[PDB]
Structure formats: structure tokens, C-alpha cells
Design a protein around this ligand. Structure first.
Ligand code: MG
Ligand code: MG
Ligand code: MG
Ligand code: MG
Ligand code: MG
Ligand code: MG
Ligand code: MG
Ligand code: MG
Ligand code: MG
Ligand code: MG
Ligand code: MG
Ligand code: MG
Ligand code: MG
Ligand code: MG
Ligand code: MG
Ligand code: MG
Ligand code: MG
Ligand code: MG
Ligand code: MG
Lengths: 85, 79, 120, 157
RNA sequence: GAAAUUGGGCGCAAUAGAUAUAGUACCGCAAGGGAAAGAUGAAAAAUACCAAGCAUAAUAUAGCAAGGACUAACCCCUAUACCUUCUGAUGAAUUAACUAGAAAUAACUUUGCAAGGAGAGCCAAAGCUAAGACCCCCGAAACCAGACGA
RNA sequence: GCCUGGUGAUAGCUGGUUGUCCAAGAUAGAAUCUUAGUUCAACUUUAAAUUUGCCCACAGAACCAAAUCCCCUUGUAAAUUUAACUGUUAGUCCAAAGAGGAACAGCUCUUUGGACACUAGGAAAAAACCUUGUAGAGAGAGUAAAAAAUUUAACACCCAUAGUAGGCCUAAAAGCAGCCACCAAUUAAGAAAGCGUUCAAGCUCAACACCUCCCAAACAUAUA
RNA sequence: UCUCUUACUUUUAACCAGUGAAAUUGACCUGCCCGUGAGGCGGGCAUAACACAGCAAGACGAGACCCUAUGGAGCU
RNA sequence: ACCUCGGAGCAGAACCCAACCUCCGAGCAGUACAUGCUAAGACUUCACCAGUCAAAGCGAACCUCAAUUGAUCCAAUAACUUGACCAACGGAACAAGUUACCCUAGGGUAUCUACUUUAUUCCUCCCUGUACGAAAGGACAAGAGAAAUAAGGCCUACUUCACAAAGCGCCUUCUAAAUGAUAUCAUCUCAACUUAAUACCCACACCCAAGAACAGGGUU
């Protein structure tokens, strides 16, 4: 029953993101935290490269529009500075 | 002869609904085609110069004295 | 003969009814798409197989970020029956280098830049 | 098999699923709509002129005869200036209330024929009706006074 | 396809190796074809365990004979034999043994030496020398020569 | 004839080709005493060198439909060249455009694209339809495709005189053997729409007055 | 011969005793109906196990006919 | 009937695309004699072979057509050149019919399952020559017969024969009404109501009407 979980903003599969799969399964009995799970390290690597891609594409879009606005402003300056003499 | 159940119609329909929303989100680009031009030419060129560079840097590995002599250890014995 | 299909432009023009249906604004549109393959490239022509490989959607049910520019939209229009597209919405900002590791893309379509595992 | 065949060709299964999904759906209202809410003036002028004409009127159930028998009755009453009139009671029920005949509203239904008159040969008409053991005299009305059949015996006598 | 000219075993060991214990037995009128097989020990003047096939020990609803299993052999569930030939009939009772990829022109890899290489001959506008690394088994009807046969 | 030899004759044909594990890998054709085969190409494989390949936007490609070519951006990561060779080819079916045939064939021949000769799930079984691909263990989870729906046909009760047996043709054919007009009376029944008679006479209609042995078992009620 | 077959004798047979083959054979724990494309696959049904004698519906098993080989041989 | 080459359709818009598919054609002719010589760059019949186009240059003036064709070797020739309906048109330097005599290599004594004791018809006669019809005509049903076949037995006779088995012999064979709604009449009602398998079988040894063996029956 995962369409319900999509209604609530959860992962459609309870083995997705969230507290069942991302907290560590075990600790030491002293209370020392375990070394991290292999799948959680892998998964954090995937999420980080995804975030880097979001930032990278966003910045290329913004730099793209700024460079276009310089080309338009300099076209208009080349219009007004050639209507003289 | 094969006939169409309610499962098949409801499945077909939910695919049609995903499709219609794909039509919606493709109807409003962030840039025009004039604005996007060359906005990523540098990164594409550097990426291909990396592909090109890994292609043209292919050569036999270094050979070492220590490996060849290290084969002598197959008759290491005790005393 | 089975050929490659052009799709007319009236198909990709939203109506205000559709702005009431989905959550979109025609002014100030979204920058990034999330694309997911939800259908197989098997039994599909080789050109659609290729476009799926270019967009980086070889694995199904795995989201991919794209730009909402007309080039990427052209490739998406070719394989729009195999994928799902949602806008990448960002409730907080795009992640800085401090919040780069601690992110999570939720199911809603939003990308949260502080992902604790505590209840609110 | 060609694209045009003599029999209806079997569709591909996704063709058939498209055809089933895109069937016509008719609109359904919340409430069913069915569960929601010249000759005439010729008879009015003609028979309304017959109202002002007659001083005396009578009527019978003149359906119980043959064609030549109604010809005999037509000639034997042609011997008088009485007139016989086969006309629908459908229009005659508003005729009576127009002519202020409240005692005559319960009179005119079923098969009937008018015997409008100014001179009573109606005793001799009874003399014609006594030889035929049927076709009774239905009550009339001389000058806004009703005639029962007993009144037809009294007045006709 | 010339010439001048030049100058004991990285074998086999009884289906192997000889056909060979023998050109015997056997087959054929004849020319001719042509086998198989033995295993003690110093002394015979000292008489284990292992192929298929069976037996000990026949069988129990159901089905390419198994697999998942299971407290439990079966019962439950899943499961269209293998090879080869076709886009998708052939051959095999079973066991043992025997039975089928042979060539280094050129290229490549690794050494040596290097405007030279090679233990004459040959190649050489980085070559030449050396090595490594590539090329199956069975099966006709026939044709010809010489014998042996009425 | 038969034997020995040439002789391990030859066979584009049949049959067969023996450890392990991984990887890459399938459908244009041209010639040929050729269509049971070969050669070249195409495709495939390894190694090497380099630099673009693929997707594509405007513009552009002729007179007498679906699309394609071309193609910067962009999204990607491949491509070409050099060296060395093997192997594969009547493919089959489905969708589409067609040709031949019977708008027959599990029929024949082209084109475009899938799928199959590679996995698994579904469709009863199931090469080719649908879902789905990259490989291991798990007594975890979310999904994809995915279950055939239908059941029929009542009908108006009456009410019918008269110019007239409408003229002409026709033995007579009268509303009904044919032509023409098709007016008219009462309140209203056509110079007639079906039976019917040689012809008639008789019956209805419109209109008047009331209005080899079937093949899951089954089940219509609990919230998707 | 047949309508239309019957009886008997011998042989064969079957049982007992001795002796003791062969073609065949992927493995078999070897059912029916319908369906598919049929002992084995699907849906139904059936179903303790085991010899002996029969039967011959099925399983499993030459002679033709056509084509091909840059295959032969013979005849005119 | 065909075998090579070209045009058009198939194959509508870059190129390509088959068929013993649909239609046309070709195997030359004419003019010129710079139809000389050279040479960047290209196209190309899906390979190769062949094919095509060509600026600049030197030298001079001041080709049309679509196809219109043939490799190598060999010949002929002083040389330049020339040589095939080699049309089976990528062409072997020169070789026919036939084989039902053809030949070879290829292509298209019961093991298992299953099984081995689940009353019809004709003619006659009667009812009846009645019913029904009106005369001609003419029933059914049920009954008696005689036959025949099939099924199951049996031997008293007959016959083949003879402690018995047989047949040619005998025996037995069991949907239609009323009523009636929808639609107050009616209406056969995919309206409701009412009305029109028994039998069979069942607990050593010797002889046997039981029997292949086993089994079975009898042995007082
Ligand atoms: Mg020997
Ligand atoms: Mg053993
Ligand atoms: Mg089972
Ligand atoms: Mg093998
Ligand atoms: Mg002699
Ligand atoms: Mg050979
Ligand atoms: Mg050959
Ligand atoms: Mg692989
Ligand atoms: Mg030839
Ligand atoms: Mg061949
Ligand atoms: Mg370009
Ligand atoms: Mg014996
Ligand atoms: Mg069958
Ligand atoms: Mg079988
Ligand atoms: Mg038996
Ligand atoms: Mg030959
Ligand atoms: Mg070419
Ligand atoms: Mg030829
Ligand atoms: Mg030729």
C-alpha cells in the first residue's frame, strides 16, 4: 500500500528513504556508534553527486541568462553608438 | 479472440494521466532557444578534451626489476 | 510504414485549466526537471532506446535532473511516453557546500537540504 | 492479410485497448429528465349559432342504426324543420358552459345527435321511435327549461 | 620450375607398439583377406576395497522421476529428456578403453643488437635477428594397372 | 566378376569434433555452370592512432501521406583512421505501407520498425503479442503486465352512405385490366391504399361519432 | 470356395522338467477426455500393488515418388 | 517464357529497395575531324572490375541522343590499331538425347498403453371395412397370429454326430391442457398458479457337466 505513502510525502516503498533504512541498525552496548552501513555510505554518495548536479545545472542556467543579457545590452549599445557622427 | 478487462482499462488510463502531466511540464521552458545557445559550450568542450585525452594516453605499463627478481622466491626455504 | 512521430505544438501549450489542475505558473517557470524511466525501451524503436541512454535513464525508477531548456525538452518530447517528469521544486535554497552531503530528494518532488531522521 | 479485408480484421491488442478506453461516454444528469415536470372555430360559430336558433332541443343515442335506416330517419325528420346533428361532445362540453347550461352539463357524453327545433313534431318523432324497441329519448331543454322524457310526453302530447 | 656459381630416445608398454604368441587359427576354388590372447612367489620339491550386470533386499495412487522442501521415503508445490539438423526429424541398451585443428608469409607480443642486423647466401629510408602464437575425423558410386577365377 | 595396388581416390553432401571460467557479438548487397557453394562488401572481433560521433534548429533540397536528407545548439560518449583476421545471411512472426494470389493460406515478394534465434513475469498451453532486461545470496518490501462483457420484436377498439356501375377503351371490366380528371354531398369516408371476383357482389385501410466425452468449480449484496 | 460354419485326429499350444537364441532397447515412476502444438504441455477426470493367458485400436517400427550434385555409369 | 543494358510505376518528399510484378524501349544513327595533349577536385549502380563529371594549363578556334554494349588470354599488324548474338551478355578455347536397369551422396517370436460377459421389424387378421368423411375413401390403439433378424440359452427330438460338442434344430426376449395478467376483451405462460428399475450376484489326494496355469464345484 504505497500510494498512501505518496500522499503523505513518504517514499512509496518503506525500504526507501526515511528512518527505517537510514538509522544505523546497531550500536555497541557501551553506546559507541557503529561504523556506517555500506549501503548508507553508497546512498549518501549518490545523494551528494545528485546535489552537486542540481547546483551545477542551476548555475549554468543563471550564467546563461546573464551572458545573454550582456549580449542584448551590448547590441543596443552598438545600436545607439552607431547612430551618430 | 482476447477481450479487455477493467484492470487493462484502468492501467491504460493511469499511464495516459502520467502522459498528460508530462505534456503539461514540457509546455513552459525556462529559456528560449536563443538564450540557451552556447551556455554550456565550455563544459562540453572540456568534457570531450578529457575523453580525447584518455584516448591518447594509452601505453604499456612500466616493468620493474623487483617483480622479475621476486620470482626467485619460489624456492625460498628454511635453514 | 512505422516512422518517427512528429508531435504538433498545440500539444505543448498549457491552458489555464491545466494551471488549475497541476501546480504550475506560466510566468516564472521551473528550472530543473526530474525525469524517471517508468516504462521499458524494449519493444520501442532504436531512437527511443538512444534518447533514454543520452538522458541517463537506463535504470528505471531512478530520478535524474535535467534543465528545462528547449534542447532537453526536445529529447524529452521524443520519449515522453516512457518517462515521468516533475518540476524540481526547492523549498529551501539550492544546497551550499555546508549542506551538500545532508540532502534528500523527497517523493513530492522537493529537494530538502537538511535531512535529519528525527520526527518533527 | 492485407490492410483491407473482407472480414473485420482482428486488431492488435493495444489497438483494442485504445478502442475500449476511448469509447463514448454519454452525460448522466443528476436527475433523470423524464422524472421532472379553424375547424374548431367552425364548430364554435356553427353550433353556437345553433344555440341561439332553436327554441326547443332534444337528443338521442343515434349510433344504433344502419346507413339506410339513418337515411329513413333523416327523411322522416326532413319532413319536419327539425335538424339532426352528429358532432363531437369534446367541444360540446365547453359549449354548454359558454351557453350557461348548468343543468345540461350532465347530459352530453358518448354517442349523441342533436334534434334542434322550433316546431315540435317530437310526438310524431316518438311515434316513429315506438316502432323500434330501442334508441330512447334523452332529455332536452326548451328555453332554459329542462325536458325529462316524461316532460317530452307532456310537452309533445 | 632449372642452371651457371657456392660449399642412443621429453618412443610404445598387451585395444599401445609390429598383423604377429602367427602370416598361425579361421575365411576363400583361387589370387587373397587375416585374428584373438599373458600376468603368484625367493621357492609351488611351500597351493581385500573399485565399471556396467546382479545378489544381500520385488512392489503401493501421480506422471523426463528431480528440485523446494519437510518431523517424515511418498503425498504438497514447481518443472515440454539430451545431441544434431532446420527461422523455431537424426542419433544413442549400458559400462570400460580407444577415437578428431597438422603450416609461422605478413602483422602482433617479448628479448638482443641497432644505421645496421644475421654464425657467408638475406633483408634494411628503424631496421634486422630469435622466440611465442593459425589452419580437423569418418563415409560413396567410381576410374586405371596387374593378378586370380568356367 | 573378384582381389591387390594407385589409395588416406574424390565428396560444395551427411554425420562427428573431447577441461574450466569470464568478456564482445545476428539479417544491406554484388557477381558466380550460381542460388546445398565461394569471392568481395556489409555486419561482427581484437589491437593501435587520433578527433569528433550520436541526438539535432533556423535556413535549404522540382518541375511534370507518414516521414527523410541536411543540421549549429544541447544532451551525451563515442566515432573515424591504421593493423590483423575469422564467422553470419532463403531468416521467422507481429505492427504499418504496398505487389502477386481468392482483399485464401502457418502462401509468395519488397519497405519501415519491433520481437525471437539472449532473461524473467503475464496471456490456458505458448519462438515472434504485452510487461521486463546485466546477471550473486536473503524465510524482506514496492510495483509492471495481468480476470471478457452482452439477452432481444404485443398493439390503436371502432367504422364506412351518396353524385356513380367516373368517362373512354374494353363482351363489361365499375376505386380496384389500362389513359386521364381526380370536383363534390351532408358533419364526414380516397373517383381509392391492400384481399377479392370475367365483370360484379362482398372483406380490411385512411376519415367520421368515445378518446471418442460438456468441459475449472462456482458466485448477482461488506465500502478499492 | 460360399450361405454358414461344425465336429474330430495330428501338430502347435498351455503346464511340468532339461537346454537355451535373436531383431529391439535415450531414460521411464510408461492412464482417459477435451484443448494446444500428445503417455508426458494446459483444464478436467481417474487412480492400492502385482503376475499368467489373449487381442491387435494406438506407441515403437522396407518398397516407392520428386528434386539436387559444375557426383558417377551405361545406351544411341 | 526468359537470361545483358536503359526509362516509368511499385518505391508520392535525400539515396537505396524485390517479384515467372505492371508498361515502354536498346544492341544505333547523324554531325564533326583540336572526337588534340595534359590536369586540381569530385561522383559512382550498394564490393571489385568497369563507369561518369571536371576548373586551371599547353595547343588551337574566334558533339546530339538514355540505352546504343563485352574483361583476360590469345590472334592479325612495321606501327597505330583491329578482333566475338563470347546475347547463357563477369565471357570454360572447342562437348547432344536418354536410363521402368540406372548407381552413389543427400534433401522433401507382441515390450508398453488400451481392451478381453454394459429387443426390433415385416406380413396377416381382428377391433372394422367402425371411428372420421358426405361419397370416394377409410383409422387407430390394444389384441391374436405367422415370419425374420438381433440378444440370451439349450439338446427332447431332427441333423453333423454319439458318456459330449453343435446347427440347419428348439427355447426365451419387459411437451399438452385449462385458467389468466402486463394490455381489465383476448392471449399455450422466456407471467404467476393448477393438471398430466426391477431382476442377477451376495456364507492332501481323487473326480468333475469347472478349467490354459491358478482358481471353482463335488468326495456321505
Ligand atoms: Mg595388430
Ligand atoms: Mg558395481
Ligand atoms: Mg505432481
Ligand atoms: Mg555435445
Ligand atoms: Mg574348368
Ligand atoms: Mg574425404
Ligand atoms: Mg563439391
Ligand atoms: Mg555478454
Ligand atoms: Mg560462366
Ligand atoms: Mg553448392
Ligand atoms: Mg556538422
Ligand atoms: Mg521350460
Ligand atoms: Mg490429441
Ligand atoms: Mg512419447
Ligand atoms: Mg500381457
Ligand atoms: Mg564432376
Ligand atoms: Mg558504391
Ligand atoms: Mg552464364
Ligand atoms: Mg552472367
Amino acid at each position: 500500500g504505497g500510494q498512501w505513502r505518496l500522499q503523505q510525502g513518504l517514499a512509496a516503498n518503506p525500504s526507501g528513504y526515511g528512518p527505517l533504512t537510514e538509522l544505523p541498525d546497531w550500536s555497541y552496548a557501551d553506546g559507541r556508534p557503529a561504523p556506517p552501513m555500506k549501503g548508507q555510505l553508497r546512498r549518501k554518495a549518490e545523494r551528494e553527486t545528485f546535489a552537486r548536479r542540481v547546483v551545477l545545472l542551476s548555475q549554468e542556467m543563471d550564467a546563461g541568462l546573464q551572458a545573454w543579457q550582456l549580449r542584448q545590452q551590448k547590441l543596443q549599445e552598438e545600436q545607439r553608438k552607431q547612430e551618430n557622427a | 479472440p482476447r477481450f479487455v478487462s477493467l484492470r487493462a482499462k484502468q492501467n491504460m488510463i493511469r499511464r495516459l494521466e502520467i502522459e498528460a502531466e508530462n505534456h503539461y511540464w514540457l509546455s513552459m521552458p525556462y529559456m528560449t532557444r536563443e538564450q540557451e545557445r552556447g551556455h554550456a559550450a565550455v563544459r562540453r568542450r572540456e568534457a570531450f578534451e578529457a575523453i580525447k585525452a584518455a584516448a591518447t594516453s594509452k601505453f604499456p605499463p612500466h616493468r620493474f626489476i623487483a617483480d622479475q627478481l621476486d620470482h626467485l622466491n619460489v624456492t625460498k626455504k628454511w635453514s | 510504414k512505422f516512422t518517427r512521430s512528429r508531435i504538433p505544438e498545440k500539444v505543448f501549450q498549457a491552458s489555464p485549466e491545466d494551471h488549475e489542475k497541476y501546480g504550475g505558473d506560466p510566468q516564472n517557470p521551473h528550472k530543473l526537471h526530474i525525469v524517471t524511466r517508468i516504462k521499458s525501451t524494449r519493444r520501442r524503436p532504436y531512437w527511443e532506446k538512444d534518447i533514454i541512454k543520452m538522458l541517463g535513464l537506463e535504470k528505471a525508477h531512478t530520478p535524474q535532473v535535467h534543465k528545462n531548456i528547449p534542447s532537453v525538452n526536445a529529447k524529452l518530447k521524443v520519449v515522453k511516453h516512457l518517462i515521468r517528469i516533475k518540476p524540481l521544486k526547492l523549498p529551501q535554497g539550492l544546497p551550499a557546500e555546508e549542506n551538500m552531503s545532508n540532502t534528500c530528494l523527497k517523493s513530492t518532488g522537493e529537494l530538502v537540504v537538511q535531512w535529519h531522521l528525527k520526527p518533527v | 492479410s492485407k490492410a483491407v479485408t473482407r472480414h473485420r480484421r482482428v486488431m492488435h491488442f493495444q489497438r483494442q485497448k485504445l478502442m475500449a478506453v476511448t469509447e463514448y461516454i454519454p452525460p448522466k444528469p443528476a436527475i433523470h429528465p423524464s422524472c421532472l415536470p379553424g375547424l374548431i372555430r367552425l364548430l364554435r360559430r356553427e353550433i353556437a349559432a345553433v344555440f341561439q336558433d332553436n327554441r326547443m332541443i332534444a337528443v338521442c343515442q343515434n349510433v344504433a342504426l344502419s346507413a339506410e335506416d339513418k337515411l329513413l330517419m333523416r327523411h322522416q325528420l326532413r319532413k319536419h324543420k327539425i335538424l339532426m346533428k352528429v358532432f363531437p361532445n369534446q367541444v360540446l362540453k365547453p359549449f354548454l358552459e359558454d351557453s350557461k347550461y348548468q343543468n345540461l352539463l350532465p347530459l352530453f357524453v358518448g354517442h349523441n345527435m342533436l334534434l334542434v327545433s322550433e316546431e315540435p313534431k317530437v310526438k310524431e318523432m316518438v311515434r316513429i321511435l315506438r316502432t323500434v324497441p330501442f334508441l330512447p329519448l334523452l332529455g332536452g331543454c326548451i328555453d332554459d327549461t329542462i325536458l325529462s322524457r316524461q316532460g317530452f310526453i307532456n310537452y309533445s302530447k
